[PDB]
C-alpha cells in the first residue's frame, strides 16, 4: 500500500503532501520527494524529528524516546515512523517536549 501524508508547518503556515509506502519511514519519503525536515539522531532516540498527529495512524515501534503518555497524546518521531493509513501531521514540534 501507499499512503497519503499531509505535512503541516503551523508556524510557517505550509502544507505539503507526499505519498509514502507502508514500508518506508515518513522522513525518508519526504526528503526523496524534495521536502527537508528536521532531524538529528535519525534513530528514534531523540526529539528533533518530532511531529504531532492530526489524523490517521502510524507504526513507530522502533521509537525509544517517547513515553506512553506522549504517544497517547499523538507525538511521533518521524524518522522511525511508518504510516499505517492516510495521515495528517504537524511538523516541527520538538519544543513541545520541554
Ligand atoms: S531524529 Fe532523533 S528520534 Fe528522529
UniProtKB/Swiss-Prot annotation:
Keyword Iron-sulfur assigned to the entry: answer is yes
Return the PROSITE patterns for the record.
2FE2S_FER_1 (PS00197), 2FE2S_FER_2 (PS51085)
Binding-site residues, [2Fe-2S] cluster: 41, 46, 49, 79
Q: What does changing residue 69 to K do?
A: Small effect on electron transfer
Cofactor(s) listed in the protein's UniProt record = [2Fe-2S] cluster
Question: InterPro entries from the entry?
Answer: 2Fe-2S_ferredoxin-like_sf (IPR036010), 2Fe-2S_ferredoxin-type (IPR001041), 2Fe2S_fd_BS (IPR006058), Beta-grasp_dom_sf (IPR012675), Fd_pln (IPR010241)
Q: Name one GO biological process term.
A: electron transport chain
Question: Taxonomically, which superkingdom?
Answer: Bacteria
Q: How is the cofactor bound?
A: Binds 1 [2Fe-2S] cluster.
User: Which consequence is recorded for altering residue 94 to K?
Assistant: 20000-fold decrease in electron transfer
Q: Which UniProt keywords apply?
A: 2Fe-2S, Electron transport, Iron, Iron-sulfur, Metal-binding, Transport
The GO molecular function terms of this record are: 2 iron, 2 sulfur cluster binding; electron transfer activity; metal ion binding
Annotated ranges, domain 2Fe-2S ferredoxin-type:
3-95
> Does the keyword Iron-sulfur feature in the UniProt annotation?
yes
CDD domains recorded: fer2 (cd00207)
Explain what the record says happens when changing residue 68 to K. Small effect on electron transfer
Database matches in PANTHER family: FERREDOXIN, FERREDOXIN-2, CHLOROPLASTIC
**Of which family is this protein a member?**
Belongs to the 2Fe2S plant-type ferredoxin family.
- Role noted for this protein: Ferredoxins are iron-sulfur proteins that transfer electrons in a wide variety of metabolic reactions.
NCBIfam families named among the record's database cross-references = fdx_plant
* Quaternary data: Forms a complex with heterodimeric ferredoxin-thioredoxin reductase (FTR) and thioredoxin.
Q: What is the official name of this protein in its record?
A: Ferredoxin-1
Gene giving rise to this polypeptide: petF
Amino acid at each position: 500500500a501507499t499512503f497519503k501524508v499531509t505535512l503541516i508547518n503551523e508556524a510557517e503556515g505550509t502544507k505539503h503532501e507526499i505519498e509514502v509506502p507502508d514500508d518506508e519511514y515518513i522522513l525518508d519519503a519526504a526528503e526523496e520527494q524534495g521536502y527537508d525536515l528536521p532531524f538529528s539522531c535519525r534513530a528514534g532516540a531523540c526529539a528533533t524529528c518530532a511531529g504531532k498527529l492530526v489524523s490517521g495512524t502510524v507504526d513507530q515501534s522502533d521509537q525509544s524516546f517517547l513515553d506512553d503518555d506522549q504517544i497517547e497524546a499523538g507525538y511521533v518521531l518521524t524518522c522511525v515512523a511508518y504510516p499505517t493509513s492516510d495521515v495528517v501531521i504537524q511538523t516541527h514540534k520538538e519544543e513541545d517536549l520541554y
